[PDB]
Amino acid sequence: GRHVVQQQVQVLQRQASDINNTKSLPGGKLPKPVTVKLTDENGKPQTYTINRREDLMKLNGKVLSTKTTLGLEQTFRLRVEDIGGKNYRVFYETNK
Ligand SMILES: [Ca+2]
Description:
- The protein is mostly beta strands and 96 residues long.
- The chain has one domain (7-89).
- It is 15% helix and 43% strand.
- The protein is built from one helix and five strands; from the N terminus they run αβββββ.
- It has one helix spanning 7-20; strands at residues 29-39, 45-52, 63-67, 73-82, 88-94.
- A hairpin with a 5-residue loop joins β4 and β5.
- Calcium ion binds at residues 11, 14.
- This is Filamentous hemagglutinin.
- The PDB classes it as toxin.
């Protein structure tokens, strides 16, 4: 029960909601892949391509680095959950 204030996670939450509301093409791919942008534990930018809605589950448990408004890095563990019917929610949990 933590309010997600980190930009990168907030954008991914919106994208997951976008995907949840997008119909798949026959065979299960999204009509257009969604590009997700994160920063990994070592501080490197990463981008990932979401071709199918379930691809979002591959981000579950990924350790991310975020920057506070004070300029300090914070690491978090990303969480992605299927609440029912392949509808995904994105949140985080502390890493250390
Ligand atoms: Ca946004």
